[PDB]
């Protein structure tokens, strides 16, 4: 590995080896003349020492370098350590068709797609591009192809797209927390400097499409293609293979719109408007209707696959909501339109999804979810959903609750001053007082922003589901929870822990009121802590994890049946007050032993 233009510098690659050869020669010169004992013994000792250093410098002695006190890495220090031939060498190597890819967000192009940027392309497709050109005879010579590529014909764009059609690639995220992050999907040529994905596998690749990356994978063999399109395909990566649980579900603002569609303040315009359904698009789409519609009757022809392998339609005249009838047009046949009979929430979105996926089938359910995403992507703008200062309105009871908690604290302090209340008694009681006042103010604010609204009607009082955006967020269930609003709405809370102890003064203000100097400086310990928490704990986590993966490197099923009744029993953990969980999931997909029988005797 020459450095300066002049000298090679295989330092210890031979400097150890060369020193060894040199001393060896010196010996071959010396002891053959009946060596003096002192010299010969010292030399042989150095010889053992140096040979060891070449094999294990660290055991005894040291093999430090010129201008560097650091020792020399012996022959197995090329075997031992983090960066050896035993560095990530059970397959951790630098690869061919990929690299350091930036990402876009695929408003269009449903899951049966993957947005591959055209810029990175054809430096991939080039071997295949040349194969196509020669098969097309577009350049009888390889150099002819090389220049015509260096010429960059647009007919090449045509050829690449034709290849880019029937050849998906594989996509992935890095710190591979799963077999869930990496996707194979239908690649598509696109123009810019980022690759777009459907709002689907946003969970799969598991990062979040900000300053980040994804990966490019070239399934070279046809078997690679068939497998990834059948295995690495996200066309099946819904249910959490561990949890069984469908990971794939719209949970972003597509939900927010889905909710906005089926709601009703009290009674919108012509709330008694009723139809059969195909023209609801005409009416609300023309005018006269809002998704805020109440009591709109609708002749609904639900279908049930009640017949064995056969669905029987069934026409009702159910009254429903505007967007309810709409998404009823979205759904396929089987679900009772009572599926559409909902306030239509996030968990519900998942729930209908589950009902379907149990019910219909894979392509069916997938298409349903996809168009679901489509409709939501329409509605959220068809909503839009402003935000603003006033949607934060503090319930007025806050000032009085504060005055009262302060009164309690002052009473505790005066009691401690009288000596009747111990300081620790003062502390525990004051903690209780603050907690109680906090709960009270929390309830006050929540009522201020619960389903609380006065609307015009015949009764002139129809307290309905209100219309603040943030409370709607906590409700339908997209981004945040009640805790988020409260801190931005109620006081900062106790949050009183420099390290573990409870700071007496509680941080008492919301994002509405700002904060205080001491308040913010207080707020910093836990924040830097939690960041450092994710930081350092990733480490021990991965360590244990690899420990496991090694510990499970050979695990497989080789037999179908054991022919044995031995096992352990599956029983509910009626633990604490009750069962933390029903004994339902723990054996949901079970195969009990020959021990299953009815509660009746001999039954």
């Amino acid at each position: 590995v020459p450095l300066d233009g002049g000298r090679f510098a295989t330092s210890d690659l031979n400097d150890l080896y060369r020193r060894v050869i040199n001393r060896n020669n010196r010996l071959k010169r010396l002891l053959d003349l009946a060596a003096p004992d002192i010299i010969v013994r010292n030399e042989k000792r150095m010889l053992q020492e140096a040979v060891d250093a070449l094999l294990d410098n660290g055991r005894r002695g040291r093999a430090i370098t010129g201008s560097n006190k650091r020792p020399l890495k012996s022959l197995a220090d090329m075997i031992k350590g983090k960066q050896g031939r035993f560095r990530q060498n059970l397959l951790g190597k630098r690869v061919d068709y990929s690299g350091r890819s930036v990402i876009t967000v695929g408003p269009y192009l449903r899951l049966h797609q993957c947005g591959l940027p055209k810029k990175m392309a054809l430096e991939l497709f080039k071997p295949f591009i040349y194969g196509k050109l020669e098969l097309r005879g577009l350049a009888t010579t390889i150099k002819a192809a090389k220049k015509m590529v260096e010429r960059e014909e647009a007919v090449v764009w045509d050829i690449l797209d034709e290849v880019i059609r029937e050849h998906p690639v594989l996509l992935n995220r890095a710190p591979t927390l799963h077999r869930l992050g990496i996707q194979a999907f239908e690649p598509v040529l696109i123009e810019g400097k980022a690759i777009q994905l459907h709002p689907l596998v946003c969970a799969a690749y598991n990062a979040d499409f900000d300053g980040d990356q994804m990966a490019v994978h070239v399934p070279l063999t046809l078997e690679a293609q068939l497998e990834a399109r059948a295995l690495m395909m996200s066309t099946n990566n819904i249910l959490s293979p561990a949890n069984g649980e469908p990971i794939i579900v719209p949970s972003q603002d597509v939900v927010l719109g889905l909710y906005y569609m089926t709601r009703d303040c009290v009674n919108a315009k012509g709330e008694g408007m009723v139809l059969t359904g195909p023209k609801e698009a005409e009416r609300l789409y023309r005018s006269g209707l809002a998704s805020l519609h109440a009591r709109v009757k609708v002749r609904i022809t639900e279908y049930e696959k009640d017949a064995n392998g056969e669905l029987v339609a069934k026409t009702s005249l159910k009254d429903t909501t505007v967007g309810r009838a709409i998404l009823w047009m979205i759904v396929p046949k089987g679900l009772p339109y009572s599926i559409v009979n909902q306030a239509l929430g996030k968990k519900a979105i998942s729930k209908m999804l589950n009902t379907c996926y149990r019910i219909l089938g894979l392509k069916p359910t997938v298409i349903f979810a996809d168009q679901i995403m489509y409709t939501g992507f329409a509605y959220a703008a068809r909503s839009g959903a402003s935000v603003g200062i006033d949607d934060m309105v503090i319930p007025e009871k806050k000032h009085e609750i504060i005055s009262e908690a302060e009164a309690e604290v002052a009473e505790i302090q005066e009691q401690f001053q009288s000596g009747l209340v111990t300081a620790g008694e003062r502390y525990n009681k004051v903690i209780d007082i603050w907690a109680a006042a906090n709960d009270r103010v929390s309830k006050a604010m929540m009522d201020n922003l619960q389903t609380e609204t006065v609307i015009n009607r015949d009764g002139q009082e129809e307290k309905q589901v209100s219309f603040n955006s943030i409370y709607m967020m906590a409700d339908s269930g997209a981004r945040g929870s009640a805790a988020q609003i409260r801190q931005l709405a109620g006081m900062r809370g106790l949050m009183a822990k420099p390290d573990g102890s409870i700071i007496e003064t509680p941080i008492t203000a919301n994002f509405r009121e700002g904060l205080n100097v001491l308040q913010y400086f207080i707020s910093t310990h836990g924040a830097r802590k939690g960041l450092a928490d994710t930081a350092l704990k990733t480490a021990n986590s991965g360590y244990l994890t690899r420990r496991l993966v090694d510990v499970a490197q050979d695990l497989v099923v080789t037999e179908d049946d054991c022919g044995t009744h031995e096992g352990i029993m599956m029983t509910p953990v009626i633990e604490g007050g009750d069962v933390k969980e029903p004994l339902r999931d723990r054996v949901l997909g079970r195969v009990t032993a020959e021990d299953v029988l009815k509660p009746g005797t001999a039954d």
């Binding site: 022959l75 090329m78 075997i79 990530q88 397959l91 951790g92 190597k93 630098r94 690869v95 061919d96 068709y97 990929s98 690299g99 350091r100 890819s101 930036v102 990402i103 876009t104 967000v105 408003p107 991939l124 071997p127 020669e134 992935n172 591979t176 927390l177 992050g181 810019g192 400097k193 980022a194 499409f209 300053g211 490019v216 070279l220 063999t221 690679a224 497998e227 690495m232 927010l256 992507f377 959220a380 703008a381 068809r382 909503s383 959903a385 935000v387 603003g388 200062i389 967020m473 981004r479 931005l488 700071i503 994002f511 205080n516 100097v517 910093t524 830097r528 960041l531 450092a532 930081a535």
Partner: protein
């Protein structure tokens, strides 16, 4: 009176509630004062080299009757100019020349000086000057000498209790960290016994030190323990006791109190019992002999007759030995106390545990540990012990260390010796054992009273001292060897080691770091950080978490959110707005004394030890005009747990809301609702800026960016100039005023700006001028303008209007959706410049020559090349054509009949050289802005090179000619005026110079005399000018020093310019990011009621999740400012009345809460209003404090005054089908900026990449069209696929296989669709490494 003339062009709306008292400091006091003192000559040798030389200076020969002295030292003025070094490539370094004094004294004469060489000075190296902008200039690059903040030297009473004990015990250690030497430790073991530790080795006896320290066991006990008299004469078994002295033990029996038994037998000790016992005098009262048996003998007594060693010391008394002693030795003997209730010996135990009893034996074990073998000869151990700690030139801990221990000893003085002292460690063990038994509070690590940030100046002082010792020894050696000489004090003078060490510790290290010039903030802060990393602090980022907490004394010290995203977080602490430095090594913060409640204007710089003392409040408060307090109950900090404090409680007041933050955040926009998560995320996205095409000023920032510029130093401040003369596309000339003019100088300023100059990390950083002409300028005024700022504001960015509303799949969470306008509007374009070069290398096979005569080459490639090969300056680049056209000469050809016929046919080539040329980097293209070249002396080619030489000369020449002309005018006028009143009409003296008729004799007396003098001075100036000219011209072709390798070193530089694109990374100061990924045309941008195609649509589905209440708080403000501009803009578009827009302005400034005073129509003359508006060109600039910013009611107020939705609700028309949709949204114009990690800095592909020579492994990562390396968690997941063929190709197709990649490409062309694995070659490599190790390695069948 905000004259603020350069700021009279544009000011920000303020609402800053609390009023300024002491503004920002120079914001650069740090990397300035220390090095300033480093090259400061002081009356006392007290700092810098003043002491450091005073250390290792005088060398006395090995009794050669010869000693060495010195007079004074000099560091030079420059070699080259700063930019000159930038051009050539040189380290800005200045020599150190020190006068030496070498005296030969005659023998047999007591210091009888005989001969002296007190006349030979040594230039001991070329030392580097810290820059005016505090930078380095060594070997070229831009670097920051990052300091360290680390543990102070002194007494640290370590606890080390709990979990490390692993025994359910709380330990009590004693840690001392000297600045020089090892560490002496008095550890404690689980056995209630102390342990001696030094330099992290095996345990040493606690008693080892004392006995080795000539301390007898008798002395050791007499000091260590207090002994009762215990006078039992005539078998009285009576002892003298004080119930105050020892108490708290139940009286077992034989408890009688001066007659009457006050303590019953078996009666528990009572405070009433102790009080009554103290009430009456107590003599020696008989005690049970059982109290003797446990009693340990204090003194060693011998019998009165025989000096027997009976009753050895540190031994519990034995009744039989008690009788023997009471009969033989005496009646009274010293005994022990060891009140285990309140005390514990812990010393007699280790004294018994002590194996060596003599000072020699004790000193011997010390070496036996230190040297495992090589037993000393009773002098080597003694010498090692004395020179180990009793030496002044080996440990010399610290004088601040002296103050530190002395305070830790509560010693009235604080100035000590760096050397060891016995009373020190004695009291040290005393305190350790005392706190173990409980006497005071142990120290604290993450608390601030104990650390210092270790500067640069003494660091270099130290490196110099380190070298000074290294040569002092050889100085002594030469003074011993061949001392028979009276030569110059240069005999062993080799400064090469000195220069090498100073450079290396500075240069190639981690102590400093190559400074980057991203946006002004990069330097605004990367000169302002404190971390423990390096030689000091936390030797690894691993091995520490506890100090990474939010420290309580640390507030106005480190910045509040400023720490990286990762492993060095929590510890890279950012100096504060109120930052000062302690007297010793630490940092304080100024503080207004709340004197009797009244806030003294006096600010006292306050640090940790002081900080916990007085009573300290929070500023977010009102204060009365008398200075009286608003509320009587004020939450206040006393010792890190703040609480309400009386109006008679708080002792001080701070400065201002800037107390809590540095600037490295304080340029954060309106965090009053920002999440802390958002907070640190935001700032560590804040510095990521690089400049754009046009600078457009932030509309609502914090208010200091002007000041930041005042120190950001990227434009020209106007020091001492009065009238601007010449400003040109690279020149600015300003002629000073006489009142401020110092005579004998020209009195005019010519300042040069570097256009098109790549910066530290290769940006566009162009200082571009301000005024046009005919302008007055005040002292220090900015006129240039470096990048990404405009007319005086550190704005990494500019207002683009945007709206928050979900839409159509482009807004999942984190996409930023701007429409086609800015792509047309260029708003934020890029311009970046990477460097280039070439080399010559006169070789053994022959010098390579730059002639663009590459054999077998195309003319077009050569066509851009000129005769030099230096391509004509100014062309485009695309592809990889050769830029520098060099050829490598090779060995000559023989008769060579084939080559003979070749040179006969073509000739002139003979293949004598090979095309050895330089080209444009792959995929990297552009056009040049300037170039460079280094010709070492010894070659004078100068092909296209003399062009730059000449252009440079032209510039400099025109430059000198200016001053020449000006002073020439002064003189010619002085002459024609001297010719005035001489009857000499100016028609003649104007007609020709003519030496003014060569003193025509108008007075012929003093006019003759004055004329002679004037012609004299005239020629004098002519000569002086020509002389400076000649020196400069010599400097022109002065020539550079290349390495011995390449004969000439030509350096190239070009440009590349970028616009935001599909795939871009912008962000806003509320820390929200975005992947810019769908730019629609102008139509689909949502249309307003006036239809205005709004620019940027974001996802809104997060404003709660990370607390983006601040982003919308702005957005309200931002819409408001666009509106305020709209009103004024229509007003001007009407060309309305001057006072019309005037009242508009005064009103717009006048609404809201009362903060600060700004008023027009009494100060600005009308055109100052005229321009003041003409600049007011899209919105009124507005500034708020982070923590004293505006109130929301003000926003609601502002939104009506210019006819805007204070609600912020307003409809729109859709961009494709255009039905007005619900949700009347809020929108704004919140400024955006661009970070590094460019989209163009990303994408990369390769299908046949470099399989290595070693392992035929990939080239690397895009490095030569290299690629990625797969992921192990992913590969295991792949196993989850069982994607067997995928693995098969990934390791056979997608590994090193030449024999496999070849057949694979062949088939891939052939459409065969198969892979041939064979066998991995890394397998062969490892198999060899096994056979390389002691292993026969093979595979059977």
């Amino acid at each position: 009176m905000v004259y603020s003339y350069t700021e009279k062009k544009r000011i920000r709306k303020d609402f800053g509630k609390r009023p300024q008292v002491l503004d920002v400091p120079y914001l650069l006091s740090i990397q300035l004062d220390s090095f300033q003192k480093f090259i400061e000559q002081d009356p006392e040798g007290q700092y810098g080299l003043e002491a450091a030389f005073r250390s290792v200076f005088p060398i006395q020969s090995y009794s050669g009757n010869s000693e060495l002295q010195y007079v004074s030292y000099r560091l030079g003025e420059p070699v080259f100019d700063v930019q000159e070094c930038q051009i050539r490539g040189v380290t800005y370094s200045a020599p150190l020349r020190v006068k030496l004094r070498l005296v030969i004294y005659e023998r047999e004469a007591p210091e009888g000086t005989v001969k002296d060489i007190k006349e030979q000075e040594v230039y001991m190296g070329e030392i580097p000057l810290m820059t005016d902008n505090g930078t380095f200039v060594i070997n070229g690059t831009e670097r920051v000498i990052v300091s360290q903040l680390h543990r102070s030297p002194g007494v640290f009473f370590d606890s080390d209790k709990g979990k490390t004990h692993s025994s359910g015990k709380v330990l009590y250690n004693a840690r001392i960290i000297p600045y020089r030497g090892s560490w002496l430790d008095f550890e404690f073991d689980p056995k209630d016994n102390l342990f001696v530790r030094i330099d992290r080795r095996r345990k040493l006896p606690a008693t080892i030190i004392l006995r080795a320290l000539n301390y007898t066991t008798e002395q050791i006990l007499d000091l260590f323990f207090e002994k009762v008299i215990f006078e039992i004469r005539d078998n009285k078994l009576q002892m003298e006791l004080v119930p105050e002295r020892l108490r708290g033990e139940t009286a077992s029996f034989d408890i009688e109190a001066n007659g009457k038994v006050y303590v019953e037998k078996g009666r528990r000790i009572t405070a009433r019992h102790i009080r009554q016992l103290e009430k009456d005098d107590v003599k020696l009262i008989e005690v049970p002999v059982e109290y003797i048996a446990g009693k340990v003998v204090a003194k060693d007594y011998i019998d009165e007759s025989t000096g027997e060693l009976i009753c050895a010391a540190n031994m519990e008394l034995s009744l039989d030995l008690l009788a023997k002693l009471s009969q033989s030795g005496h009646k009274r003997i010293e005994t022990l106390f060891t009140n285990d209730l309140d005390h514990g010996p812990y010393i007699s135990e280790t004294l018994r545990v002590d194996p060596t009893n003599d000072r020699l034996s004790a000193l011997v074990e010390i070496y036996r540990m230190m040297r495992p073998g090589e037993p000393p000869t009773r002098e080597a151990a003694e010498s090692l012990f004395e020179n180990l700690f009793f030496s002044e030139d080996r440990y010399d801990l610290s004088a601040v260390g002296r103050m530190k221990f002395n305070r830790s000893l509560l010693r009235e003085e604080i100035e000590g010796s760096g050397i060891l002292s016995k009373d020190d460690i004695i009291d040290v063990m005393k305190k350790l054992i005392d706190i173990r038994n409980g006497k005071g509070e142990v120290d604290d690590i993450d608390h601030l009273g104990n650390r210092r940030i270790r500067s640069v100046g003494e660091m270099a002082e130290n490196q110099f001292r380190v070298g000074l010792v290294r040569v002092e020894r050889a100085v002594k050696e030469r003074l011993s060897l061949g001392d028979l000489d009276t030569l110059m004090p240069q005999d062993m003078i080799n400064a090469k080691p000195i220069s090498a060490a100073v450079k290396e510790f500075f240069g190639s290290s981690q102590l400093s770091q190559f400074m980057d010039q991203n946006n002004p903030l990069s330097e605004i802060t990367h000169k302002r950080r404190i971390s423990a990393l390096g030689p000091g602090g936390l030797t690894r980022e691993r091995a520490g978490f506890e100090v990474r907490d939010v420290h309580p004394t640390h507030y106005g010290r480190v910045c509040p959110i400023e720490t990286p995203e990762g492993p060095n977080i929590g510890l890279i602490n950012s100096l504060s707005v109120y930052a000062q430095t302690n007297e010793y090594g630490f940092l304080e913060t100024p503080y207004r004394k709340v004197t009797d409640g009244v806030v003294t204007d006096e600010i006292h710089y306050l640090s940790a030890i002081e900080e916990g003392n007085y009573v300290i409040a929070q500023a977010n408060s009102n204060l009365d005009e008398e200075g009286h307090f608003v509320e009587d109950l004020v939450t206040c900090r006393s010792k890190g747990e703040s609480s309400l404090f009386s109006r008679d409680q708080v002792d001080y007041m701070d400065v201002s809301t800037q107390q809590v933050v540095s600037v490295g955040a304080s340029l954060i926009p309106f965090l009053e609702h920002d999440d802390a998560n958002r907070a640190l995320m935001g700032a560590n996205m804040q510095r990521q800026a690089v400049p754009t095409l046009r600078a457009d000023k932030p509309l609502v920032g914090t208010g200091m960016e002007r000041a930041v510029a005042v120190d950001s130093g990227v434009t020209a401040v106007a020091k001492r100039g009065g009238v601007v003369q010449y400003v040109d596309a690279s020149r600015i000339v300003i002629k000073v005023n006489e009142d401020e003019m110092y005579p004998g100088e020209a009195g005019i300023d010519i300042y040069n700006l570097t256009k098109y100059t790549r910066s530290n990390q290769n940006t566009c950083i162009n200082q571009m001028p301000c005024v046009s002409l005919g302008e007055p300028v005040e002292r220090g005024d900015v006129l240039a303008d470096g990048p990404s700022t405009d007319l005086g504001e550190l704005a990494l960015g500019q207002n683009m209007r945007v709206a928050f509303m979900p839409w159509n799949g482009y807004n999942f969470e984190d996409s930023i959706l701007v429409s086609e306008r800015v792509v047309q509007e260029d708003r934020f374009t890029t311009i970046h410049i990477q460097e280039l070069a070439c080399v010559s290398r006169d070789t053994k096979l022959g010098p390579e020559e730059i002639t663009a005569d590459i054999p077998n080459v195309g003319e077009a490639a050569l066509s851009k090349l000129d005769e030099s090969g230096i391509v004509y300056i100014g062309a485009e680049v695309t592809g990889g054509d050769i830029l520098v056209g060099k050829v490598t000469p090779k060995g000559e050809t023989q008769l060579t009949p084939e080559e003979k016929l070749l040179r006969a046919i073509f000739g002139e080539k003979a293949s004598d050289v090979k095309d050895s040329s330089l080209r444009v980097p792959n995929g990297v293209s552009g056009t040049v802005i300037d170039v460079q070249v280094f010709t070492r002396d010894g070659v004078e080619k100068d092909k296209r090179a003399l062009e730059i030489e000449e252009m440079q000369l032209k510039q400099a020449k025109k430059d000198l000619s200016e001053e020449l002309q000006i002073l020439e005018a002064g003189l010619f006028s002085r002459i024609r005026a001297v010719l005035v009143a001489g009857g000499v009409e100016a028609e003649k003296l104007d007609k020709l110079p003519r030496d003014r008729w060569l003193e025509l004799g108008l007075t012929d007396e003093e006019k003759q005399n004055q004329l002679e003098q004037l012609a004299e001075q005239y020629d004098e100036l002519k000569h002086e000018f020509e002389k400076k000219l000649e020196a400069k011209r010599r400097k022109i072709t002065q020539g550079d020093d290349l390495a011995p390798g390449v004969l000439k070193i030509v350096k190239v530089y070009l440009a590349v310019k970028r616009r935001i694109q599909p795939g871009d990374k912008m962000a806003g100061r509320h820390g929200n990011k975005g992947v810019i990924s769908k730019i629609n045309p102008i139509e689909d941008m949502p249309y307003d009621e006036n239809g205005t195609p709004v620019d940027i649509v974001l996802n809104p589905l997060g404003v709660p999740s990370r607390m983006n209440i601040g982003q919308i708080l702005e957005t309200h403000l931002g819409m408001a400012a666009k509106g305020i501009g709209d009103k004024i803009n229509a007003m001007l578009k009407q060309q309305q009345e001057v006072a019309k827009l005037r009242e508009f302005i005064q009103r717009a400034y006048d609404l809201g809460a009362d903060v600060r005073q700004k008023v027009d129509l009494s100060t600005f003359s009308d055109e100052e209003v005229m321009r003041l508006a003409e600049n007011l060109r899209k919105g009124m600039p507005i500034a708020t404090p982070v923590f004293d910013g505006a109130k929301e009611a003000e926003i609601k107020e502002l939104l009506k005054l210019g006819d805007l939705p204070t609600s912020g609700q307003i409809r729109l028309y859709d961009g494709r089908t255009g039905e007005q949709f619900e949700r009347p949204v809020t929108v704004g114009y919140m400024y955006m900026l661009k970070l590094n990690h460019l989209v163009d800095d990303k994408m990369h592909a390769r299908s046949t990449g470099s399989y290595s020579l070693v392992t035929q492994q990939p080239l690397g990562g895009k490095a030569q069209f290299g690629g990625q390396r797969f992921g192990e968690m992913e590969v295991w997941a792949l196993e989850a696929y069982g994607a067997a063929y995928t693995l098969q190709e990934m390791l056979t197709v997608k590994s090193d296989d030449v024999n496999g990649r070849t057949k694979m490409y062949k088939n891939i062309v052939d459409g065969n669709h198969q892979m041939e694995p064979g066998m991995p070659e890394s397998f062969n490599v490892l198999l060899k490494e096994i056979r390389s190790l002691g292993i026969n390695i093979e595979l059977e069948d």
